[PDB]
Amino acid sequence: SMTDLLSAEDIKKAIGAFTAADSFDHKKFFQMVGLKKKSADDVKKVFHILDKDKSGFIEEDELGSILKGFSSDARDLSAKETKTLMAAGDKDGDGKIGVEEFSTLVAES
Ligand SMILES: [Ca+2]
Ligand SMILES: [Ca+2]
Numbered sequence: 001s002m003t004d005l006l007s008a009e010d011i012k013k014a015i016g017a018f019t020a021a022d023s024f025d026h027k028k029f030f031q032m033v034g035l036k037k038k039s040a041d042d043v044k045k046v047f048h049i050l051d052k053d054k055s056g057f058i059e060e061d062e063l064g065s066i067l068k069g070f071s072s073d074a075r076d077l078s079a080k081e082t083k084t085l086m087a088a089g090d091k092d093g094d095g096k097i098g099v100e101e102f103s104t105l106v107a108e109s
Helices: 008-017 026-033 040-050 060-064 066-070 079-089 099-107
Strands: none
Touching: 008 026, 008 066, 026 079, 026 099, 040 066, 040 099, 060 066, 060 079, 079 099
């Protein structure tokens, strides 16, 4: 599970920094949660958890629920946050974040 890939302490702090609606900053969240300490293969393992339905893509529903993929206590993303995150991650413009797109988003954080 996520707390086997990332530390629960780091997840707690990361989620806790973004409790207010509209606060989410993907670069800062990825830093805080420990994604900037992970190998390329472990970044992909995190993706696969976030891809809740195992389609190979983080669709809009899974994107709005992204924080819940890290902690089930978390809020849904706000509308502003989902729009800016999708735009940041969806480089090919198809409305979803795929494997490489997620890896790139993390690498650049
Ligand atoms: Ca999916
Ligand atoms: Ca895409």
